[PDB]
């Protein structure tokens, strides 16, 4: 375990349960694919923190069953006309009226930005990338959040990294490119 112990100690139970459900759907064992497990929890938590930093500004799409995620996406499209994305995004921004894809990477933010923009191939979805180094990259350099909220996300990601490092897990996690 070790990685599993750390995941259960640093993420709240709701997130852990959501991550285990995601992995039981994919067919993957969180006791085996430990680095994926941690990356899923981290990404889930960034999405929830992002949303929570809003007069009810964000709708969370990530973390729901696919049925219900698509139900939410469809509802938003029918009530705004916003083009329906091709891949499930992570949040909807009602203030700006755009979907958001959140990326968390152990590599350089620009590399992973390029990789996500190339994947989603949709000019509609705003993209926001975070590293474990306090760096971010976002479409048009439009970061959406205020400094406080982005700083809190940066802090938590760095803290997770240092917690992994103190437990000797960071090097495997960093080289694992799995989940990001
Ligand atoms: O950032 C992400 C990385 C991976 Br790998 N997958 C997703 C995803 N999968 N289904 N909905 N979102 C992300 O948002
Ligand atoms: Mn997602
Ligand atoms: Mn994402």
Numbering used by the authors: -1 to 52, 73 to 198
Direct quotes from the study:
A click reaction between compound 14 and sodium azide results in the formation of tetrazole 4a, a commonly employed carboxylic acid isostere, which can be deprotected to afford the tridentate MBI 4. Among structures, compounds 4, 8, 9, and 10 break with the chelating oxygen triad motif by replacing the carboxylic acid oxygen with a nitrogen atom. As expected, Mn1 is bound between the phenol and the ketone of the hydroxypyridinone core, but unlike previous MBIs with a third oxygen donor, rotations of varying degrees were observed with the heterocyclic MBIs when bound to Mn2. The tetrazole in compound 4 displays a slight twist, perhaps due to the same reason as compound 8, though the rotation appears less pronounced. Interestingly, instead of incorporating a more distinct twist, this structure adopts different metal–ligand binding distances. The distance between Mn1 and the ketone functional group is 2.3 Å, while the distance between the tetrazole and Mn2 is 1.8 Å, both the longest and shortest metal–donor distances observed among these inhibitors, respectively. The average distance from the metal cation in each nitrogen-donating structure is 2.2 Å, matching the donor–metal distance in oxygen triad MBIs, furthering the argument that the rotations of compounds 4 and 8 result from attempting to optimize metal-binding interactions. Interestingly, several nitrogen-containing isosteres were found to have a bridging water molecule between the nitrogen of the hydroxypyridinone core and a nitrogen from the isosteric groups (see compounds 3, 4, 5, and 9). Compound 4 showed activity comparable to that of the parent structure, possibly due to shorter metal-ligand bond distances. This is perhaps unsurprising, as tetrazoles have been widely investigated as isosteres for carboxylic acids.
Among the most important influenza virus targets is the RNA-dependent RNA polymerase acidic N-terminal (PAN) endonuclease, which is a critical component of the viral replication machinery. PAN is part of a heterotrimeric RNA-dependent RNA polymerase complex, which is composed of PA, PB1, and PB2 subunits. The PA subunit, which enables endonucleolytic cleavage, is composed of a C-terminal domain that is mostly structural and an N-terminal domain that is catalytically active. In native PAN, the Mn2+ cations are coordinated by His41, Glu80, Asp108, Glu 119, and Ile120 and five water molecules, producing an octahedral coordination geometry at each metal center.
